[PDB]
């Protein structure tokens, strides 16, 4: 759902992905409602656009 509705990754691309944990940077006692995304699209995604 992230590789078809928000941003896909080409098979032949340079570089890679670095990831970590954001429990001490994103979690709040009032809830995490500020962040938004997309999860509905009729078709697939062309490379590198928003």
């Amino acid at each position, epitope marked *: 759902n992230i590789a078809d509705y928000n941003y896909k990754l080409p098979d032949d691309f340079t570089g890679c992905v670095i990831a970590w944990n954001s429990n001490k940077l994103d979690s709040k006692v009032s809830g995490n*409602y500020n962040y938004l995304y997309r*999860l509905f699209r009729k078709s697939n995604l062309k490379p590198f656009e928003r």
Partner: antibody
Amino acid sequence: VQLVQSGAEVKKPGSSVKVSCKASGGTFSNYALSWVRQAPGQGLEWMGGIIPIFGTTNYAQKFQGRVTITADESTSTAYMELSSLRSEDTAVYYCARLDGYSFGHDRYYQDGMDDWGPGT
Amino acid sequence: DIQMTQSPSSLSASVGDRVTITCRASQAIRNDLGWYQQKPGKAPKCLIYAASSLQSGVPSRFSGSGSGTEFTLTISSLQPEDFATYFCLQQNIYPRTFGQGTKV
């Protein structure tokens, strides 16, 4: 959140059948409440899910014009009244809070169907 | 309306085999994936959150594999408490299906 369904109704035809479901705890608006019918000789089938605040009350085929569904604005209790009792209305009714879009917080797309009718 | 048909539910296997419970599809949907289970006399239970996710509180016995017009429930090794009825969930208008399961 926990769902408690209503008791047994009258088996004799000529009147209406009423099913009630109470969502104790977590009374949140815009959560759909779906009703399902289960038979000993037939699989379960969907009829409708009620949304309290948006007002959309979309039904399914072959029972339109015979059902009236109401619910409180802050969820709590929900009632479904169905008229035109016939000889093929022997079944059991279950209710589940159907996970739809939430406009107030956009929080959960589908929390997990954990609440259901206990069975009467 | 329309009916979303299925293969017959006369599926049975011994302990240690692979079950191939089949739910067909005439269309394709993504965010409506999910299965329900029902033992006779008890409340229904959700089987999977989606096709790629499992329920919080289920083992890896049930696996739901499906991305297009076919959907399968697969068992690595069977359990004596598997005797229930399984129903796949498809389409926004929600046409429910038929399910039956008994090892014999």
